[PDB]
Amino acid sequence: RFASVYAWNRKRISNCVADYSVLYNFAPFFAFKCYGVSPTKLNDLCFTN
Amino acid sequence: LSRLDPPEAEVQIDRLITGRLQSLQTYVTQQLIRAAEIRASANLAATKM
Numbered sequence: 001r002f003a004s005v006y007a008w009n010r011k012r013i014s015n016c017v018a019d020y021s022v023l024y025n026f027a028p029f030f031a032f033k034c035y036g037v038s039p040t041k042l043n044d045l046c047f048t049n
Numbered sequence: 050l051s052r053l054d055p056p057e058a059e060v061q062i063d064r065l066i067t068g069r070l071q072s073l074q075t076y077v078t079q080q081l082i083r084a085a086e087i088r089a090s091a092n093l094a095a096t097k098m
Binding site: 036037038040041044045 | 051
């Protein structure tokens with residue numbers, strides 16, 4: 001279930017072990033653009049929120 | 050060097066180096082001016098001595 005462009009849902013993710021390797025590995029995920037960060041270093045960073 | 054990849058973070062490091070060199074050249078110029086001032090003062094002090 002995904003909402004429209006307006007009144008979009010917001011999910012807070014915190015206190016968990018992140019693993020971005022399972023994100024860009026999917027085949028249909030053609031568009032993967034990042035701003036201010038690199039896709040290869042996503043699994044080595046630490047985010048406060 | 051940890052958030053972004055080196056091939057995508059080269060311009061940031063270049064701009065940082067440029068800014069630091071520009072900030073250090075002004076310090077070198079101020080040091081040269083103050084050294085000339087101190088040299089003139091020391092010459093005057095030696096003449097008075």
